[PDB]
Amino acid sequence: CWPQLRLLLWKNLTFRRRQTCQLLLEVAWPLFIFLILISVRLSYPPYEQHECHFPNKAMPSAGTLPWVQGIICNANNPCFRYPTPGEAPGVVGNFNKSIVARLFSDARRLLLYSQKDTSMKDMRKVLRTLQQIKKSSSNLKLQDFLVDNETFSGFLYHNLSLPKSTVDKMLRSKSEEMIQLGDQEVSELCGLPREKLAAAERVLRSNMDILKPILRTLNSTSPFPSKELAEATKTLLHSLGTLAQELFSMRSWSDMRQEVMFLTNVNSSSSSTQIYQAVSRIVCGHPTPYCNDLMKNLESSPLSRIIWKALKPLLVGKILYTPDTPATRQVMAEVNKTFQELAVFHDLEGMWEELSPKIWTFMENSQEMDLVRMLLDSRDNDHFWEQQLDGLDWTAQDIVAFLAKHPEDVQSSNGSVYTWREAFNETNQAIRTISRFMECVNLNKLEPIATEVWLINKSMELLDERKFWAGIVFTGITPGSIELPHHVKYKIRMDIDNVERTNKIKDGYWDPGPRADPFEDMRYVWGGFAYLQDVVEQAIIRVLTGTEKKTGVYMQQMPYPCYVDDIFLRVMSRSMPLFMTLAWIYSVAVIIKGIVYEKEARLKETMRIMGLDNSILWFSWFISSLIPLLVSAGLLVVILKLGNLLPYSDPSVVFVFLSVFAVVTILQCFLISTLFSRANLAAACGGIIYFTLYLPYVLCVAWQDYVGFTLKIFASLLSPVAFGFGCEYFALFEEQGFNLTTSVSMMLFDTFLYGVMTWYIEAVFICMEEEPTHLKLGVSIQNLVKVDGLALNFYEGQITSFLGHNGAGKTTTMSILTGLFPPTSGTAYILGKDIRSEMSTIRQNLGVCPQHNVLFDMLTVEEHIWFYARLKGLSEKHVKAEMEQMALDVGLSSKLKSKTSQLSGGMQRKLSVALAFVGGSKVVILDEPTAGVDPYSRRGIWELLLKYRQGRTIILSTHHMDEADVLGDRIAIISHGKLCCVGSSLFLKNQLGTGYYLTLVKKLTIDVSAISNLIRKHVSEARLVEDIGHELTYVLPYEAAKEGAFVELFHEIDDRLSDLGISSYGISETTLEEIFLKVAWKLTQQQFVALLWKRLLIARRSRKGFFAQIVLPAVFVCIALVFSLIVPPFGKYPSLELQPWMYNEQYTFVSNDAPEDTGTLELLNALTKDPGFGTRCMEGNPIPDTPCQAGEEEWTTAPVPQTIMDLFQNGNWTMQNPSPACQCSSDKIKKMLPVCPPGAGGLPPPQRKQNTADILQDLTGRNISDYLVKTYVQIIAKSLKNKIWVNEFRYGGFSLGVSNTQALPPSQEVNDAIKQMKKHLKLAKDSSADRFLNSLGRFMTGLDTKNNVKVWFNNKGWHAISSFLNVINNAILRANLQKGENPSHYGITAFNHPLNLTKQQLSEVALMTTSVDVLVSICVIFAMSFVPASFVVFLIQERVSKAKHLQFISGVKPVIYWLSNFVWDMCNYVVPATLVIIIFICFQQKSYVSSTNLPVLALLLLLYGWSITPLMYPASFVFKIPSTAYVVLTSVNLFIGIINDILKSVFLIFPHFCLGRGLIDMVKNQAMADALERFGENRFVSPLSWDLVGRNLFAMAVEGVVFFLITVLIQYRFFGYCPQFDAITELLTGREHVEFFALLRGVPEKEVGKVGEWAIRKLGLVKYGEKYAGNYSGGNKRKLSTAMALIGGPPVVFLDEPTTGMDPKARRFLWNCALSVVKEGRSVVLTSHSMEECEALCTGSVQHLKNRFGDGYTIVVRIASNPDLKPVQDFFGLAFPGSVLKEKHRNMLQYQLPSSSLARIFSILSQSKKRLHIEDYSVSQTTLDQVFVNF
Ligand SMILES: *[C@@H]1O[C@H](CO)[C@@H](O[C@@H]2O[C@H](CO)[C@@H](O[C@@H]3O[C@H](CO[C@H]4O[C@H](CO)[C@@H](O)[C@H](O)[C@@H]4O)[C@@H](O)[C@H](O[C@H]4O[C@H](CO)[C@@H](O)[C@H](O)[C@@H]4O)[C@@H]3O)[C@H](O)[C@H]2NC(C)=O)[C@H](O)[C@H]1NC(C)=O
Ligand SMILES: *[C@@H]1O[C@H](CO)[C@@H](O[C@@H]2O[C@H](CO)[C@@H](O)[C@H](O)[C@H]2NC(C)=O)[C@H](O)[C@H]1NC(C)=O
Ligand SMILES: *[C@@H]1O[C@H](CO)[C@@H](O)[C@H](O)[C@H]1NC(C)=O
Ligand SMILES: *[C@@H]1O[C@H](CO)[C@@H](O)[C@H](O)[C@H]1NC(C)=O
Ligand SMILES: *[C@@H]1O[C@H](CO)[C@@H](O)[C@H](O)[C@H]1NC(C)=O
């Protein structure tokens, strides 16, 4: 069986090897598509992010400064890549390195020190004691004061204009110089040098006075003289020493000024990142017109956009409020207390202004400052004070301190400048700048509003002012004195731009990454919502309970474990089949086209005839079409593995999966192919069928409702879902490198089911001659039983013809001869071999040739003949020799390699019948060969048949008469399934033949009675059988031939041929055909309405016809409506959300860090009592919540695996501080989405307790940062391997704790210190000192944290932050209440509900809605441009030799025909138009009761035909292919349908008709939407639905198609009957056909039927009148076509080939009707191929044509044997030298005598009849075919 399959695959591949265009594109398309895919992939490189930790935020509950820093420091969430110390369980503040906090702590230290410092009082009492004992110590540079008992040189000396010394008589040029020198040298130790210098130029007389100053000792030795003041001086030294140590131990103000100087001091001062680095180091560690000007500059400042967006609303925004209930007035009080806690800086400018002169004069002129300066520099101070300062801290120096302590002027500037004066400049400048900046903040942001409508109006009014902060709206009952209803409910209404969208609560589809973009997702921490939430909760708790703050709250994001952004890979691997199988769509279309093409010309059936079963053909198609699929899959695997697209999977498994999918899809192709019967129809519809087969996978990918065995239910029945599921498994296991085995099994089962379905569809869709025993019997059929009984025998070399009526068999008989259907209880001896006993050996030697030619197109003759010889089953040399021998004599040695498609039809038939004889088949059966063949080639095919008749048993079953007679030597006639007669032609004629016929011809002018009487005189048996123009025919019986008068009458007619008016004569033998029959204007309007009456019938009768013209658009608009009713409006941002967990399944965790049970224990208890984890209060408030408080109150640990020893040895080499496990971080070349924990990071299962829809994990002392990162992956990987499409595991928890108490004593001491300070140091009760001191006290009080909780919120959940903040604040309030009856009653809820959108936002959402409705528009335009496809395809249907030309012969005025067609097109278009108007008029989309929708949509839809249908007509003029425009027109309409350019598109689409329709519809829809949204809440504008913008342009563009219709009519104008092909509409009936043609003829309607019912009776067809035309046979169709010409009876008629392979006993009425038409008196014209029609109907005359152009007489004679043949030959050769033996066989021969004179031949044969024993003899003339063969 191998050679059969080999040759079968050979021809299968040669169908494609000879095309060179389909195979090339088939190979190129997948390569090009996947190269484009790879280019797209490489255009999007994967993004990799490290495992990054997030800095913790702060909130006003903690303190103003921490969250101010959080706003300014970390507004980007920079992903520190390592655990921030804030994320540690214990330490939270994260702000040691912040020097601003250091400055504030130093200020607090200074306040607490000055609370208990008495240095100033010591100075005052020292000065008082000095004044009341010494009374004179004002010893400045000029003069020295000393008024006492003169303990140490008590005297005075003044540096004045003259030398004055009150110790003696100074007596003074020299005096002034000495005084000036002393004043210049007035220093601690310069007095002695000045005295020495003076004494150098003076005498010792002034020396004695110089002796007095020596005891002065620069006012140092004097203090030692008084013992009472010594203790006070020592106390002063100690006090100033410790004060200086404290002042120099801050090291913060100096560091900040040093760091701020150099940025604006360099000459270049170029802008760079240095300023940002310095600012960050100041705020964190290493890792009116002026106000507008500064804000604009900050906005334009680089790297400041995010901080500006975070800050601007904070300090410029304003809030709103509710009816001013006194309790809510207290809420204002608390909130604006919290806000004014930051407002300390407003009064610092006033403090500077009020105390600058005082502090200036105090340290410049007061005696206390002078005493301090004097004590700061002394020998005793050098010994004691300097040593104390040096040992206290690393201060600058004692001399350095004395420099900037209390000077009088600038000493030197060139050397070094460091003085108190420059610092005082800089402090003044800094406070001026601070005041200028702080005058930009509107801290008066409390605006009560009573009504909600005015509330919202003022909200938009402030928003348009570019300043709007959040807005709080309570739900108070009445303005009553009762504070709160114990359950607080409010909505924080804030604008859209600053609050996250409230439409969706989750991310939607799962997406890797922490989702922590600083600007795009932090909208709850930079938009300020969460700050308002926390502040309002703190104020409410203060109102209801009384505790001051007792709580701080921090925000911390959930750390994320080193993801990777491979979104493209995931999204493509979720949908690889689409763009991978586009190429396979092309391939399956090609395969189905090939299969239906070979099914068209019935190649499969003929192949089955030659002895092959359908199974081998199916297997060959399988292999030959799988091989290209296999190579395509190999190329795909190569481009995937080497393309860096799907690594981590072996090429072998993907190749195997692709091969399996190819097998399944090829079996699906085989299934879907056998249901179709047209080539291009199948080729076009294969892609649509595959789309319909594939879409359910896309539908089911999202529903995920088919987890169970229903998945197998839709997998076995449907192929692409299983492959998509295997693709899903590949995507899941792609990174970490139901199951694939299940997918493979489902694919195999689906393939088997498809094969079974394909097999089922294929399976369900007297007269007897004496037989000479000398000649061998080749086919001896005896006892044939069929459900008919007959028997017949055939000879080895005898030609045989089989005749009948096509109804009594001859399709069962040849089928029995072949393998179509075995006989029932019968047998047939073929070459002595039984067909039932032998079913193999008989097939290879059985030739056959059916009606349809077997010719593989795109192939030459050599491959056809070689393939057939191979299929017959011979060797190589044998088939080569047979091929050469057949080619030598067939007549194909010229066209050795010519294309069979280029061969003529007659040559094609000759080649087919030649193929029927190749291989030396001993038996061959033909079946009406040479039907549509050239008459010239008839003789060539006859020559081939007579040459191949040497022992071959040729069988003919033809409907032709002449061929069966002249060729066939024995024929059989069968009646009603019974063999009526059989025998040779002459023998059968001998007893059942009609009388001999003789024909005479004329030149009207010849008497007929004269010749009739003359002939009747000689013989009385002559009878006239016919009388037609210029012709005459007489018949004489064979019985009593009367040879005497016979030859005599020939003698007179030869002698008197020219004597009478006759011209010549002829002989026509009794034709076998009759033997076979015997044995077995008002007219214009009438035509216009006639066309419409014609066309209404197609719609009225085609119930099962092309009804998809209505159903399909309706369904395709239904699907568009369903799609539009599901998509989100995009304008429903407002919503009414609560803030519970609001999540399906989750559980949090509580970490009681620092278990010192100070105040944290109470808060923890409040989280685990009867009130519960949420906001419930003895009732279920959240309607999703459904409390269902079921769960044990005792902690239960989850079961543990056998890894307890692993935990035991984790303590070794991994301490308590780290508890990690190694993680598989992505490599440089190797990567994955999870990170795999080899063991279990955070292995010990934390304690569990189920309370309410959650089981909180009581963590304690665990490394939470590591534990969360580990367990998150440890759970997500497990929940993703099964691919449940799982959401995030945990959405957030929180860790408690207590801040370190290393700071200064609590605010209870700071406030008392402030109170003690203010009453001292010139206490004032003004509006500046009191307010500033109170603000400073509040600022100090607002910087402590006795405890602080930290909310570990997961940012993936959009509303997690606010919800968890609300939960913890509820816990805080429940814990703070004292001696309450029950904490379950209380609780707080905080709705989020944004404002209404503004003008720009409303316009944007309207545009988005338009973008969404684009798809609805494209679907509608698809349906409305798809509807005219039916009209156009019917136009081509009637155009292809059916009605166009045929109506063109009839007077129809072609101008009005197209107008009538257009009128019908409009009249039919309304129904789909009305249905598509009604389809969405029941709903409330795109149309309403308003007059702004219906007039502009219904009219547009109705009149769209006016534009679409005229343009379709020119697309059908030159279109020589039927029923394929239905696809190409739809495709081109789709391709058409799918700021200068936008403005010019109005004129660009003005001449166009299709594209503008959808655009204008969208303009109308968007205009209506914009009008409704604007008029809902804004001013009124005139709707423009029917205005000149879109509607008038649409009307003009559509109405411009009248020109297109006129152009189509002009193109049509520019370019009896019966054509060769039948011209009948395939669904109407013949009765209505003749009615239509009669009505077009001109007969009035009152008598059209009487005419039609006449014409049908002229052609019979009583049983086929009012029936379906498509069920008619060829004979009935030809009969109807012939009647179509004779319906009106034109004076001249044209008829073409009346008989085309039609059954007998029916065509006789055809000749009768033709003769009736001829004899009625109307001239006719006829042309055909069969000369029988011409000689039977056509009347130079045929007899005259065959007389001179034709050959001579032809005689046949039979003698009873072989030896008797020689005497006949000798006698006829001697008597007649001119004779030709054309045919000769044993016992019968043919002679051709080219002599016109015939009388002597009859005389010779009659004279000596007895001697040579003549029994049967007859003479005839050459047929009309002979003369045309000669010509
Ligand atoms: C819970 O578990 C997690 C596990 O991830 C712990 O996280 C670790 O935290 C420590 C510090 O808290 C991290 O240590 C840091 O390592 C960085 C890089 O270390 C590599 O490079 C150094 C130098 O070449 C090598 O010696 C070392 O072996 C590594 O190869 C450094 O940037 C850090 O040092 C810098 O910062 C500190 C602090 O500012 C300075 O004092 C240093 O001088 C230096 O400038 C630091 O040492 C560690 O990488 C984190 N991961 C792991 C796996 O250990 C959490 O700490 C733990 N929870 C708690 C509360 O501790
Ligand atoms: C902002 O939007 C809300 C809700 O869409 C409007 O609230 C309306 O209030 C009035 C009177 O109660 C009623 O029309 C409805 O109850 C609410 N909805 C609508 C759609 O009207 C509110 O009027 C809007 N504010 C502005 C200024 O337009
Ligand atoms: C700051 O440093 C001190 C060490 O003196 C430490 O006790 C304290 O916890 C640190 N605070 C923060 C917030 O890191
Ligand atoms: C809020 O208004 C002003 C501005 O901050 C402030 O002085 C006042 O004290 C605050 N409100 C109350 C009720 O104290
Ligand atoms: C700034 O203060 C210094 C202090 O010595 C002084 O010299 C200078 O004049 C001051 N400048 C102004 C503009 O007041």
Say if residue 804 carries a ligand binding annotation.
Answer: yes
* Ligand 5 center to 433 CA (angstroms): 16
316 part of a folded domain: no
Sign of torsion, CA 17 21 22 27?
positive
User: Residue 846 is part of a domain; what is its CATH number?
Assistant: 3.40.50.300
Residue 286 is labelled as binding a ligand: no
Could you give the CA distance from residue 883 to residue 901 in angstroms, rounded to a whole number? Answer: 20
Q: What is the dihedral of CA 489, 494, 496, 497, to 10 degrees?
A: -140
Asked if residue 945 belongs to a domain, the reply is yes
Q: Which of 319, 325, 446 to mutate to test the pocket of ligand 4 (most atoms within 8 A of CB)?
A: 446
Tokens of 103: 């400055």
Ligand 3 and 91: CB distance under 6 A: yes
The pairs formed by 1200-1205 with CB atoms below 8 angstroms and a separation of 24 or more are: 1200/1244, 1200/1245, 1203/1239, 1203/1240, 1203/1243
Ligand 1 atom having least distance to the Cα of 287: 39
Which ligand is the nearest neighbour of the Cα of 429?
Answer: 5
Q: Rounded distance, CA 1505 to CA 1509, Å?
A: 5
As given in the structure block, the two tokens for residue 1373 are 């309030």
The response to whether 805 counts as a known ligand-binding position is yes
Which residue lies with its CA nearest to atom 2 of ligand 4?
444
In this structure, what are the phi and psi dihedrals at residue 1025, rounded to the nearest 5 degrees?
Answer: -100, -25
Residues 861 and 783 in one domain: yes
Give the span between the Cα atoms of 124 and 135, in whole angstroms: 14
As a whole number of angstroms, the distance between CA 658 and CA 1511 comes to: 45
Count the neighbouring beta carbons within 10 Å of the beta carbon of residue 567. 14
Q: Quote the CA–CA distance of 346 and 339 in Å, as a whole number.
A: 13
**Same domain, yes or no, for 1637 and 1715?**
yes
User: Is residue 392, in this structure, part of any structural domain at all?
Assistant: no
- Of 1438, 1442, 1436, give the one whose Cα is nearest residue 1617: 1442
Exposed e or buried b per residue across 639-654, where buried means at least 16 C-beta atoms within 10 angstroms of its C-beta: bbbebebbeeeeeeeb
Find out whether the beta carbon of 1301 lies less than 6 Å from any atom of ligand 3.
no
Please indicate, yes or no, whether residues 1000 and 979 belong to a single structural domain of this protein.
Answer: no
Residues 6+ apart with CB under 8 A from 1807: none
Does 487 appear as a known binding residue?
no
CB atoms within 10 A of CB 1025: 11
524 in a domain, yes or no?
no
Residue to mutate, 413, 425, 427, ligand 5, most ligand atoms under 8 Å from C-beta:
425
Residue 1340, token pair as written in the block: 């100090």
Residues 6+ apart with CB under 8 A from 1277: 736, 1234, 1236
Q: Give residue 519 CA to ligand 2 midpoint distance, Å.
A: 30
Q: CA dist 297 to 273, 309, 468, 744, 1090, Å?
A: 16, 14, 21, 66, 84
Query: Is residue 768 one of the residues assigned to a domain?
Result: no
- Give the position of tokens 């000669």: 1830
Report CA Rg, the chain: 59
Residues 6 or more apart in contact with residue 549 via CB below 8 angstroms = 61, 538, 1342
Q: Decide if 1527 contacts 1433 (C-beta within 8 A).
A: no
Resolution of the structure, angstroms: 4.1
Classified as helix, coil or strand, 1315 is helix
Which residue, chain included where needed, has tokens 């342009």?
1593
Q: Phi/psi zone of residue 513: left (φ > 0), alpha (ψ -120 to 50 degrees), beta?
A: left
Distance from the CA of 344 to the center of ligand 4, in angstroms? Answer: 13
- Block residue for tokens 């001491």: 1309
Q: Alpha carbon of 675 to those of 566, 592, 614, 987, 1700: distances in Å?
A: 44, 11, 16, 52, 30
CB contact at 8 A, 957 and 927: yes
Q: Are residue 1018 and residue 893 in the same domain, yes or no?
A: no
E-only strand ranges, 1328-1428: 1349-1353, 1388-1392
Ligand 4: distance of its center to the CA of 334 in Å?
9
With 0-12 / 13-18 / 19 or more C-beta atoms within 10 angstroms meaning exposed / middle / buried, residue 296 is: exposed
The CA-CA-CA angle for residues 1030, 1034, 1036, to 5°, reads 170
3-state secondary structure of 564: strand
Residue 1387 has which token pair? 């609780």
CA of 1242 to the centre of ligand 3 (A): 27
Query: Cα angle at 568 between 566 and 570, to 5 degrees?
Result: 75
User: Residues 578, 713: one domain?
Assistant: yes
Q: How many domains does the chain have?
A: 9
Tell whether 809 is in a known binding site.
yes
Asked if residue 531 is part of any domain, the answer here is no
- Same-domain check for residues 1528 and 1586: yes
In a domain, 362, yes or no: no
Residue type, 894: S
- Report the chain's terminal Cα–Cα distance, integer Å: 50
What is the CA angle 557-559-564, rounded to 5?
A: 125
Q: Which helix (H) or strand (E) holds 474?
A: strand 471-474
For 288, the token pair is 């009116």
Report which DSSP code applies to 1793. E
Sequence-ordered list of residues with C-beta below 8 angstroms from that of 1477, at least 6 positions apart, any chain: 1487, 1497, 1498, 1501
Return the residue whose CA atom lies nearest to atom 1 of ligand 5: 425
Q: DSSP assignment, residue 143? A: B
Conformational region of residue 1423, where left means phi above 0, alpha means psi within -120 to 50, and beta covers everything else:
alpha
Question: How was it solved?
Answer: cryo-EM
CA separation, residue 727 to residues 31, 711, 720, 761, 1436 (Å): 20, 15, 10, 31, 45
What's the Cα-to-Cα distance from 1515 to each of 1520, 1526, 1603, rounded to whole Å? 11, 11, 16
Number of helical (H) and strand (E) elements in the chain, helices listed first = 69, 32
Contact 1753, 1820 (CB under 8 A): yes
**In this structure, are 1555 and 1649 located in the same domain?**
no
Q: What is the DSSP letter of 1149?
A: B
> From its phi and psi, is residue 830 left (phi > 0), alpha (psi between -120 and 50) or beta?
beta
Atom 14 in ligand 4: residue holding the nearest Cα: 333
807 is in an annotated binding site: yes
Rounded to whole angstroms, the Cα distance separating 1537 from 1554 reads 7
Provide the residue range defining the domain that includes 1328.
1304-1343
In contact, 322 and 139? CB cutoff 8 Å: no
Could you write out the DSSP letters of every residue in 491-521? EEE--GGGS--SS-SS-SS--SS----TTTT
Assess contact for 1829 and 941: CB atoms under 8 A: no
Number of CB atoms found within 10 A of residue 1688's CB: 19
Q: Tell me which of 740, 763, 786 is where a domain ends.
A: 763
Considering every ligand atom, which ligand is closest to the CA of 444? 4
Query: How far is the C-alpha of 545 from the C-alpha of 539, rounded, in Å?
Result: 10
Q: 822: which 2 tokens?
A: 């075995």
Q: How far is the C-alpha of 1506 from the C-alpha of 1466, rounded, in Å? A: 7
d(CA 1088, CA 988): 58
Q: How far does the centroid of ligand 4 lie from the alpha carbon of residue 74, in Å?
A: 30
Residue 457 Cβ < 6 Å to ligand 2: yes
Residues 1182 and 1208 in one domain: yes
> From start to end of 1186-1274, where are the E strands?
none
Phi, psi (degrees; rounded to nearest 5) at 803: -125, 155
Residue 444's contacts (CB-CB under 8 Å, 6 or more residues apart) are none
- What single DSSP character describes residue 52? B
β-pairing verdict for 471-474 and 163-165: unpaired
In this structure, what DSSP letter does residue 1626 have? S
Three-state DSSP class for residue 827: coil
CB of 126 shorter than 6 A to ligand 2:
no
Answer whether residue 1191 is part of any domain.
yes
Which of the 8 DSSP states describes residue 1482? T
CB 751 within 8 A of CB 663: yes
Nearest CA to ligand 2 atom 4: 1396
Residue type, 535: V
* Same domain assignment for residues 1727 and 1823: no
Q: Which tokens belong to 1337?
A: 């006290």
State how far the Cα of 1423 lies from the Cα of 1425, in Å rounded to an integer: 6
- 1718 and 1794 in a single domain? The answer is no
802 contacts: CB under 8 Å, gap ≥ 6: 810, 813, 814, 955, 956, 957, 958, 971, 972
Q: Which atom of ligand 4 is nearest to the CA of 330?
A: 13
Count of CB atoms within 10 A of residue 984's CB? 19
Tell how far the Cα of 460 is from the centroid of ligand 2, in angstroms.
14
858-to-303, 596, 598, 622, 899 alpha-carbon distances in Å: 72, 16, 13, 22, 7
φ and ψ at residue 833, rounded to 5 degrees:
-110, 130
Pairing of strands 564-565, 1724-1727: unpaired
Nearest to 1283 by CA among 568, 570, 563, 567: 570
Rounded to whole angstroms, how far apart are CA atoms 143 and 127? Answer: 19
Structure tokens at 808: 């009594």
Pairing of strands 1065-1068, 996-1001: antiparallel
Q: Are residues 574 and 634 in the same domain?
A: yes
Residue at 573: amino acid letter: S
Count CB neighbours of 1108 within 10 A.
Answer: 12
Q: Where are the alpha helices (DSSP H) in 1244-1295?
A: 1264-1281
Place of tokens 């996978």: 697
Give the three-class secondary structure for 974: strand
Q: Taking the CB of residue 84, how many other CB atoms lie within 10 A of it?
A: 19
Please tell me whether residues 1474 and 1531 are part of one structural domain. yes
Counting from 1 in the atom list of ligand 5, the atom nearest the Cα of 419 is 5
**What amino acid is encoded at 673 in this protein?**
S
Beta bridge partners of 784: 790
